[PDB]
Ligand binder design. Sequence first.
Ligand SMILES: Nc1ncnc2c1ncn2[C@@H]1O[C@H](COP(=O)(O)OP(=O)(O)O)[C@@H](O)[C@H]1O
Ligand code: BEF
Ligand SMILES: [Mg+2]
Lengths: 115, 746, 380, 56
Amino acid sequence: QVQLVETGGGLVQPGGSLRLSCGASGSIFNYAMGWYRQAPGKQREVVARIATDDSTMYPDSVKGRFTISRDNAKNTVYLQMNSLKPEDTAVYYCYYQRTVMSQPYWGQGTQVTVS
Amino acid sequence: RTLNRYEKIANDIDAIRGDYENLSDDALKHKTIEFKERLEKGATTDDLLVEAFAVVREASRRVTGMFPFKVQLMGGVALHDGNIAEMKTGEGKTLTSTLPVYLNALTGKGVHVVTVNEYLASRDAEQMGKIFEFLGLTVGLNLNSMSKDEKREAYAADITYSTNNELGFDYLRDNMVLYKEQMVQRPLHFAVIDEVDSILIDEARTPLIISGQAAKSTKLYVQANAFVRTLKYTYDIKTKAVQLTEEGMTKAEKAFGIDNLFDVKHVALNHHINQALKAHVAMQKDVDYVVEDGQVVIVDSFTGRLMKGRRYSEGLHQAIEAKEGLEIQNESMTLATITFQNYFRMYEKLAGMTGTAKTEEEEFRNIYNMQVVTIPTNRPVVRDDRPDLIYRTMEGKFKAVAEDVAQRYMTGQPVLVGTVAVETSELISKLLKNKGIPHQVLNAKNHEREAQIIEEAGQKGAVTIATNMAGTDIKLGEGVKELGGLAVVGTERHESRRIDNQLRGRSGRQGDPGITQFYLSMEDELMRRFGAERTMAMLDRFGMDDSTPIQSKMVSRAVESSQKRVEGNNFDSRKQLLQYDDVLRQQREVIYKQRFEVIDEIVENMIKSSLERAIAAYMLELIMDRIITKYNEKEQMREFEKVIVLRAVDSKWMDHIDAMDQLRQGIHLRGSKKTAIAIAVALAGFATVASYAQYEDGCSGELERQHTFAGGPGAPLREYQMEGFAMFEHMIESIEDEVAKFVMKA
Amino acid sequence: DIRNKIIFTLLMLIVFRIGTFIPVPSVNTDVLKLQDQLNAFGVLNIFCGGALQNFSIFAMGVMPYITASIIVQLLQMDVVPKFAEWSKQGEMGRRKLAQFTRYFTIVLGFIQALGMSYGFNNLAGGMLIQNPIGTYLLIAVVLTAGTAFLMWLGEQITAKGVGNGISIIIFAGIVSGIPTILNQIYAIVRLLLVALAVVAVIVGVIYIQQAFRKIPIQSTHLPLKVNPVIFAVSFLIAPPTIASFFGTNDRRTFDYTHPVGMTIYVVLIIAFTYFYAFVQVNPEQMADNLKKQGGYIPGIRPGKNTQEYVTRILYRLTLVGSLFLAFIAVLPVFFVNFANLPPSAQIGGTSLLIVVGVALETMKQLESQLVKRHYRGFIK
Amino acid sequence: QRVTNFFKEVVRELKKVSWPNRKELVNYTAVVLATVAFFTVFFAVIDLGISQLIRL
Ligand SMILES: Nc1ncnc2c1ncn2[C@@H]1O[C@H](COP(=O)(O)OP(=O)(O)O)[C@@H](O)[C@H]1O
Ligand code: BEF
Ligand SMILES: [Mg+2]
């Protein structure tokens, strides 16, 4: 239970960086947390996932370039994107789960374009 | 498991034995009236068991001199609980049975003590009946030789000794009766079955037939046997023989004058030729039947004595008397069919005894809801059962047994040589006479002299040849016990290991020393048929021999695999017969329930229902009321519908049993390039593993894998239940039509 | 009263359905969704590649049992002689062979569980199992434990409730996909045509499998059944993937989309249909058996002439059984061609034959037990 | 050449097989539609019943 609004997307040249910020005005986050992309011609893959233990998982394609972190108080998760490549171009969505209390909750995404 | 409850009750019985022993004459017998009064006042047989068994154990000691062992008390309680008491051979089973049979007979019903054959029935009823009579109870004895009146009286006694066949025969005839007072049996109440494994397992394979004899009789049974041939199979293993010389079918098409033998117009001629072929090559002379007084009389397979009145069904009897050139008799036609299983499941309490029952406890639980209770002996069994001696064909085997009995006879040690058949018994007897040793032969050609033979078989120097009368207490002489008492020599292995151990069980008695030895050969019956096939010719190459035996763990296990396959086949046929009778059992219960009512309005309803279906086939109540007063106008009507109704029921029920029999046999299917299967496994072994171990175009990939979920196992009966069900409806309508026409029209 | 035993077959489905949502220890459950290419309705339940994959303790269902069943049936039919001796024996035959099968499924589950858990990662990032070699083995164990119970249910629910349990469990999985209708609301417009076409194929299958060759045997007819079922298409799917095993490492012609691929596909349906039903129902066996116990086909000589009779009968009969099953395999793509549809859904195929098949099989079994209380009674 | 003469034989073989009854088809399909639709409703509800239940 809450809503997710995310920001921090934009256009950058390869090698640049960006920081995605995912806020929840209704705020719980006290779970399982992730970022997934879904470029067109699509299907989405999970870019980063942080557990309730604060365990951190990334796919091999992203490994080390992205960092997931979570800010207490105000509900926010940050996806720190470094050394961006044209393959990273996609809308980026922030999702939450309680793990097995079910379904992820989407968010209206942020567009990211590496030109 | 439950053995602790049995030894407790036994100690209770033995504790109060002192307040009886002195009672002497007439007061111990008075206890019977005491138990009856208490049961009349609400007491239960469980409440009176400790005192009732103590009364019988003292009464037995005074009458027969035998005082029941505490293990025999245990056996009686297991019998009383509705279970099967397994007491090894020689532990006195017959005495033990008198404890629960007395107790459950106090309440005024019949108690059926069942045994395998009538010799054991007459012997036990005379020996044990003296104990029941001492206590003031009446003991009946039911034989095949007794008249309906005499059987009715035996059934009216408090206790009835009989055989499994006679009890089923009586039940079927009681359900053929014209008048309710012609019935013999009382309500089926308690069945204590001696030799349960033979009755409820071995002999549960066959059903019970009662053949009403009516004939359009001899028609060209002579001609069928006249055709003959020599083929050349009678399948060595599979025993029935069929005519696959196609010159066979072509030669037959000339003899009886036909273009196509198997054409439907020419049937019953094909049936006759197969029967006559079966008569000549598929069964021998004295082995499974006898030529006596010009009739062919049957050797009963494991009971071993002949059955005078019975006939081969499906026309086989006539084919054999045509084979022997004898008088071809009137034609057998089947009336009623019950199975020993479904018959004894009507008894409402049943128990059993034998030493062999443990092996099959899976059936006793499943079919009869009985659990085998293993009972400790009470004296150690010292009988020495020696391992099998395995020879090549039958010549060295028979010479070896003849040499064994010679050595033992020269020492005075009594010998009993069992065999399976008449022909093999006289083959071994000539080897005894030809070659010099005095002996008696027990046969069923000799079945008059049996008691005279058995009395002599335990004496010093006794030599006895026996057929399946081995199923047979042999008492022991004064000085023989030390002498290697009652050497038993089997000539061949039986289809079941239990049967083999009952032949062994004829020796050793309570604690007596003894020895049993089986002699076996590669041409013996099992080994060449349902003997495990492969082991033969391989070892039929070694060992042309018989000076000294063939000893290898390979042949003994291959022999053992054979005998276990036999027991498997008999088990499969047993389960086959049960499933098919289960649909006929319900129809049988319903019809005999209805026939008891017409013997004890119904006909008007039957004409009403019959007319209803006639009208609906092409109004109903208007016409019916006219037939009503027409029926009222015309005590003879009710007694004339009684005969018309009972004729129609029994006539349609007879055609129904014949038709139901031929459907159950013909419903079956069976499950199953260069082993195109070999890699067809590897193909299927991959398309499970590597298929969806990968989808590497993603789950955006194609539909080829998931999107087929392989259904069906790959490894029905109820078609028989459904049709036999529709056919029973057909039988009701035909009963209802026949009585409607012959009551009102005639 | 069948009704009070009917309560037990719904109860056994209730426990099967409740176990659908028990997750595997090694799932990160978020990635199990958003692998969703559609709306699901499940947790641990996906719509992707026209697949309902539910990765849970039951993920691989009774399916490893069915493949072990078909392998051992092929195995006893020569190859290994040890099973052939069990085949012809009986009682004992079903016993040890089904016991061997039972142990063959449970070993086949371990490798099917292993293969499903690794390849599921390559779908979702490189990511989201658990802490990635020791911890697979608990996921081979827990998934094999899923089939093991699901196997236990089948032989419990056949001896307690309605008809044979393995068939109703497979039937339960196919029919449980009702969210497929929900997912497809999506795209009155032509819906009338789709509903008429699903009733048109359920009447087409019901006219075909309930159809019977009467072969009289001497009012007893030995039915030559149906015009031979599912085991054709599953067999068919194998060979394309084996020469296609070369895909991952060392292709386009075996593509199931392409008309080289549907002709190679359709040729294999016919061959595996024909062969399997040349064996499974009425080879030489039903002839050599009529000679042991029984009569003949009227006017036809027993022996070789009976095996020639039923073989010619089988051949001409099987062509339409075969071509009927190839068409039920290719129907979904035509239904998905003019379609209102995504590549998500069951409409048109072998999913339907099992659904209609287990329905008839379980309907006929009810009544076989229901024949006591109608026309057992008489003369009153 | 072979072909044309076999297919006819196969076709002739099929009608002597008496395809089932006429109205039996409609009743039979009335059975299969009823079986799938019940389990559909039965399985559809039991999904939602577990859903609200697993709010735990
Ligand atoms: N109470 C008893 N004590 C000792 N021996 C007995 C007793 N009752 C019977 N016997 C002996 O046991 C033999 C019969 O045993 P029984 O149980 O009738 O058959 P089975 O041999 O089949 O067990 C008879 O020879 C008889 O002398
Ligand atoms: F009557 Be027995 F088997 F000693
Ligand atoms: Mg006895």
